[PDB]
Amino acid sequence: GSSGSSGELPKKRELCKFYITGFCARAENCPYMHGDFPCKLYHTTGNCINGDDCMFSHDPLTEETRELLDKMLADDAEAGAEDEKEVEELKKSGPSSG
Numbered sequence: 122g123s124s125g126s127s128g129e130l131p132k133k134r135e136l137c138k139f140y141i142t143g144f145c146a147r148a149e150n151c152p153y154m155h156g157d158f159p160c161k162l163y164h165t166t167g168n169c170i171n172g173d174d175c176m177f178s179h180d181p182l183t184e185e186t187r188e189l190l191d192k193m194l195a196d197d198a199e200a201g202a203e204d205e206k207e208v209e210e211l212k213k214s215g216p217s218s219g
């Protein structure tokens with residue numbers, strides 16, 4: 122990357138709230154980012170659980186994209202919701218059969 126600049130046009134460079142799952146009514150009509158968008162996990166720590174077959178792009182962050190994360194994260198991180206959690210049972214005792 123050398124230019125960095127990006128003409129000012131009506132295009133959302135954010136992670137579509139649908140792409141996350143894959144059910145986005147508008148495919149090529151989605152003003153948001155789908156693939157190009159850089160992977161989060163791959164960055165959060167460096168390695169992605171998915172692997173080489175990730176649904177997200179693993180390209181090297183750029184002066185541009187970089188700005189995205191700053192927002193995406195800030196939004197999510199800041200706005201966090203509580204969710205139940207527990208430790209599933211490995212193996213509960215069972216009766217006998219004869």
Ligand SMILES: [Zn+2]
Nearest residue numbers: 137140145151
């Ligand atoms: Zn979309």
Ligand SMILES: [Zn+2]
Nearest residue numbers: 160163169175
């Ligand atoms: Zn990934």
